[PDB]
Amino acid sequence: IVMTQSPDSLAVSLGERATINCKSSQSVLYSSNNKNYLAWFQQKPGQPPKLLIYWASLRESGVSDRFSGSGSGTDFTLTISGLQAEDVAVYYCQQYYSILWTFGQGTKVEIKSTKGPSVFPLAPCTAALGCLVKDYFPEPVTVSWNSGALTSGVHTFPAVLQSSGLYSLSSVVTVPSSSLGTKTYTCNVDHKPSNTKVDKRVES
Amino acid sequence: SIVMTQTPKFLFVSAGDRVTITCKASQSVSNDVEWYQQKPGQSPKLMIYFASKRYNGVPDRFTGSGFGTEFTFTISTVQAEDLAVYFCQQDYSSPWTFGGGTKLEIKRADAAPTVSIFPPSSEQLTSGGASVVCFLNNFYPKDINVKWKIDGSERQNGVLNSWTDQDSKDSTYSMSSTLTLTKDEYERHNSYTCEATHKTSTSPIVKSFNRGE
Amino acid sequence: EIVLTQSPGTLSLSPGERATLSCRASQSVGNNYLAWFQQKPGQAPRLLIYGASSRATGIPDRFSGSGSGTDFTLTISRLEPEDFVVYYCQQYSRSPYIFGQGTKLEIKRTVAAPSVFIFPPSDEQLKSGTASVVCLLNNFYPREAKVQWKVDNALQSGNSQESVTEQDSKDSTYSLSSTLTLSKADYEKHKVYACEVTHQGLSSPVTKSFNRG
Amino acid sequence: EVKLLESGGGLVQPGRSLRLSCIASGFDFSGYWMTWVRQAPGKGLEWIGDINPDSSTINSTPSLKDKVIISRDNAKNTLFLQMSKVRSEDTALYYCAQRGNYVPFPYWGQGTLVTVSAAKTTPPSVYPLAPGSSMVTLGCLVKGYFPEPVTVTWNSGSLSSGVHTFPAVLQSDLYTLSSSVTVPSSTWPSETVTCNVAHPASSTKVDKKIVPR
Ligand SMILES: C[C@]12CC[C@H](O)C[C@@]1(O)CC[C@@H]1[C@@H]2CC[C@]2(C)[C@@H](c3ccc(=O)oc3)C[C@H]3O[C@]132
Numbered sequence: 001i002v003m004t005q006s007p008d009s010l011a012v013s014l015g016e017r018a019t020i021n022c023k024s025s026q027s028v029l030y031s032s033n034n035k036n037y038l039a040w041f042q043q044k045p046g047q048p049p050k051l052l053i054y055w056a057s058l059r060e061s062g063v064s065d066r067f068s069g070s071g072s073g074t075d076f077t078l079t080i081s082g083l084q085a086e087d088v089a090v091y092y093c094q095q096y097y098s099i100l101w102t103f104g105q106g107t108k109v110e111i112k113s114t115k116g117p118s119v120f121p122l123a124p125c126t127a128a129l130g131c132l133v134k135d136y137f138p139e140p141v142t143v144s145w146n147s148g149a150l151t152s153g154v155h156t157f158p159a160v161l162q163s164s165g166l167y168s169l170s171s172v173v174t175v176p177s178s179s180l181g182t183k184t185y186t187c188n189v190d191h192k193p194s195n196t197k198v199d200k201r202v203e204s
Numbered sequence: 205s206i207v208m209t210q211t212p213k214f215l216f217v218s219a220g221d222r223v224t225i226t227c228k229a230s231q232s233v234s235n236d237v238e239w240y241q242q243k244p245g246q247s248p249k250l251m252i253y254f255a256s257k258r259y260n261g262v263p264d265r266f267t268g269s270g271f272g273t274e275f276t277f278t279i280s281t282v283q284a285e286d287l288a289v290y291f292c293q294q295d296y297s298s299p300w301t302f303g304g305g306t307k308l309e310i311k312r313a314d315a316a317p318t319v320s321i322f323p324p325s326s327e328q329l330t331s332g333g334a335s336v337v338c339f340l341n342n343f344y345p346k347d348i349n350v351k352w353k354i355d356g357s358e359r360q361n362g363v364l365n366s367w368t369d370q371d372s373k374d375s376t377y378s379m380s381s382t383l384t385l386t387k388d389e390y391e392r393h394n395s396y397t398c399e400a401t402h403k404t405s406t407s408p409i410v411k412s413f414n415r416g417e
Numbered sequence: 418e419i420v421l422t423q424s425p426g427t428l429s430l431s432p433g434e435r436a437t438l439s440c441r442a443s444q445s446v447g448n449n450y451l452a453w454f455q456q457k458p459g460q461a462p463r464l465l466i467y468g469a470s471s472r473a474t475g476i477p478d479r480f481s482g483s484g485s486g487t488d489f490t491l492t493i494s495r496l497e498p499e500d501f502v503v504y505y506c507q508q509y510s511r512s513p514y515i516f517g518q519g520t521k522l523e524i525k526r527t528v529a530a531p532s533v534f535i536f537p538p539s540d541e542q543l544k545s546g547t548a549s550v551v552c553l554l555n556n557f558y559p560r561e562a563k564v565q566w567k568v569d570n571a572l573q574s575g576n577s578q579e580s581v582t583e584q585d586s587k588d589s590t591y592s593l594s595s596t597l598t599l600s601k602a603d604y605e606k607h608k609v610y611a612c613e614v615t616h617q618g619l620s621s622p623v624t625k626s627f628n629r630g
Numbered sequence: 631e632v633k634l635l636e637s638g639g640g641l642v643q644p645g646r647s648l649r650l651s652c653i654a655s656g657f658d659f660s661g662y663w664m665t666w667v668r669q670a671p672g673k674g675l676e677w678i679g680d681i682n683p684d685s686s687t688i689n690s691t692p693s694l695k696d697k698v699i700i701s702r703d704n705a706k707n708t709l710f711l712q713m714s715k716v717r718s719e720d721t722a723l724y725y726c727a728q729r730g731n732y733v734p735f736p737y738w739g740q741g742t743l744v745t746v747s748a749a750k751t752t753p754p755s756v757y758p759l760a761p762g763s764s765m766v767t768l769g770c771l772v773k774g775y776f777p778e779p780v781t782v783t784w785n786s787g788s789l790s791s792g793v794h795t796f797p798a799v800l801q802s803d804l805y806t807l808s809s810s811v812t813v814p815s816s817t818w819p820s821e822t823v824t825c826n827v828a829h830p831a832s833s834t835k836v837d838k839k840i841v842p843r
């Protein structure tokens with residue numbers, strides 16, 4: 001039994017209503033008792049899943065009133081009536097109709113904005129240098145060096161979500177300190193959502 | 205630093221037996237404790253790492269275990285070529301620290317020495333010196349008494365002894381005894397004798413020569 | 418409630434080695450309704466084992482659950498390198514249904530002190546009205562390192578964000594970045610910026626600093 | 631197929647400086663942390679210092695920390711140890727070693743002996759040991775060299791079975807050792823037997839044939 005969610009990512013202004021759909025490849029309505037064997041989960045970065053709903057619509061203990069699933073048979077829905085900062089997370093549906101619990105692929109939920117990136121040189125007073133990619137939304141950003149010519153000794157760190165509701169990340173490369181006078185180092189930041197590429201030369 | 209304490213400090217064991225070495229840490233080091241074999245005349249060599257994994261070309265009679273503060277090195281079916289000193293060592297910290305070491309000795313049977321005596325070489329006499337050398341080879345146990353006599357009378361000054369380390373093949377010992385004299389004194393006496401006293405016989409092993417023959 | 422406590426938090430093994438993850442229950446789990454989940458980076462969870470010891474359909478040979486009531490293990494008998502990820506236990510005998518905090522399998526490799534660097538904020542960033550200071554820990558293991566900002570010798574608190582890479586595909590190390598963010602207004606109120614790094618592989622902390630101009 | 635070759639081992643005056651060099655071959659050098667270890671006469675192993683692959687890092691015990699400098703040249707594939715304010719405690723033989731990305735210390739140089747004594751360098755005189763007239767024993771006495779060590783072989787290392795090379799003895803600020811070899815009685819003097827002595831400290835080599843009297 002396969003669970004398909006949509007949308008895959010969801011941007012909804014703070015306090016607004018947010019809606020996620022889940023469809024099963026087979027009916028998970030159990031003819032004999034009239035129950036849906038469907039559950040909903042919340043998962044925040046670096047944490048286990050949190051059971052929110054099961055039997056399609058029943059709220060688990062200590063799940064806030066604003067969380068409410070609905071629908072039955074093959075098509076289901078989780079709605080967050082009043083979206084708050086703390087509700088920003090990944091949501092899965094799960095079928096337990098058959099001893100083979102399967103989850104949807106999941107849905108990311110976040111706050112709207114839509115901005116391009118800002119790039120600044122990380123350069124100090126083997127040497128290290130780098131790029132700081134600041135204040136961009138939404139994910140994702142891809143960073144290369146000298147249009148993918150330089151890859152040895154590169155580290156590009158995972159993005160973090162700032163208080164702003166905007167993302168920031170760093171990319172760094174260690175190079176021969178002797179070469180800083182002669183060979184060019186350019187970081188290439190591609191932000192497909194804002195329809196932008198930015199190439200920042202980083203100097204010593 | 206982290207203190208690694210090994211026990212026992214020595215182990216004397218018959219061929220074919222188990223030896224168990226333990227190493228204890230002043231604090232938790234998790235996996236990161238490791239065992240080195242060092243044979244005489246050679247550098248240390250890695251054998252067990254991450255307390256339990258075998259480094260390659262290590263025979264599988266060698267084995268380790270442990271976690272946190274308590275770790276062990278085991279040889280099952282000890283044999284002659286394993287004669288070595290063993291060390292534990294921790295990577296979970298800084299500085300990285302080695303244990304005190306455990307010297308392995310092989311128990312076996314008794315063996316009387318092969319005794320050979322040598323007058324000074326003409327090369328040494330040409331340059332004005334005189335050394336008498338006595339080799340006592342492949343004997344057990346290690347405890348032995350060598351004595352020098354010139355014209356039947358005992359001589360202790362100018363004698364220099366050295367023991368080889370117990371053998372990697374046959375687990376025997378060997379000894380070199382060097383009596384250095386002035387060429388003056390060498391030519392002043394005739395009969396030179398090397399006497400070995402060892403538990404394998406009540407009658408001492410005597411080897412000799414006469415200078416003027 | 419039944420609280421499930423996973424041990425250890427992170428288990429360090431090489432591919433080929435067997436792993437034993439533990440799930441300890443505060444309160445007896447009825448009918449051994451104890452389930453194990455795999456979760457890989459950027460993927461929804463995967464049922465591995467249910468009923469303490471029943472392998473789900475489509476799950477390979479090497480995953481097996483053991484134990485009853487309060488003591489449960491997941492054994493991964495012959496580790497594939499794709500298998501190094503998060504594993505959750507979860508009980509369905511009694512409400513409310515809650516997850517173990519998780520065990521992450523990572524690849525073991527010696528111990529490596531970080532290569533540290535610090536970066537002042539660029540002129541372009543200061544003109545835009547914000548000051549981000551970056552401290553870089555390069556190619557270290559294990560992941561446990563303490564990063565402390567000192568601004569005019571004053572230990573900072575909760576105005577800095579750390580980002581850490583996935584374990585490296587060549588040498589199995591991590592890199593880490595800490596970014597201290599102040600307004601231009603506030604950044605220009607202090608002279609000396611320092612990140613002090615404590616790591617297991619260092620004898621003592623290494624400090625990296627700059628004075629503005 | 632890996633080789634680490636130490637050089638610079640020998641005598642030094644107290645209070646002076648010493649540099650060791652280690653040349654590594656048969657492994658991607660610029661991909662590895664490299665370490666020095668030393669072993670005193672008393673046989674205890676003492677970790678000294680390490681380097682990450684960019685010389686942009688070090689790991690050294692306090693004890694020494696502010697006394698020696700560790701460094702390396704990638705392109706030249708060589709490792710270096712600078713000692714300053716040299717003392718009694720620094721008299722040891724020094725080991726070069728790889729640090730290893732999945733295995734602590736799998737590779738050790740043979741080790742280079744460092745001696746701290748105002749004593750003057752001296753080459754040995756080499757004297758053969760032949761009988762006064764089943765198996766026959768021969769030897770040679772290597773007298774009056776400084777400092778340690780020498781390397782002694784028989785028939786350029788082709789005779790290594792049935793050889794006993796004895797530990798040196800220090801006498802009037804000069805070392806003396808002997809070495810013995812046992813062959814079947816009909817082999818000598820019918821076939822030629824030569825002992826070969828290299829003394830790296832004086833850059834000399836002597837091949838002394840054993841002569842019937
Ligand atoms: C295997 C299972 C099948 C349906 C789900 O897809 C998965 C399941 O694992 C969930 C739970 C499981 C269900 C089978 C039936 C149950 C054991 C049932 C029950 C019946 C009699 C009794 O005395 O006590 C309990 C109530 C619920 O616990 C059940």
Ligand SMILES: C[C@]12CC[C@H](O)C[C@@]1(O)CC[C@@H]1[C@@H]2CC[C@]2(C)[C@@H](c3ccc(=O)oc3)C[C@H]3O[C@]132
Nearest residue numbers: 039051054094095096101452507508509510514
């Ligand atoms: C959603 C779920 C939550 C906890 C698990 O991590 C996943 C889960 O999908 C397993 C299955 C599911 C569980 C919720 C509770 C169950 C419905 C439970 C039950 C209770 C009363 C009853 O009358 O019939 C069955 C027994 C088991 O079937 C349960």
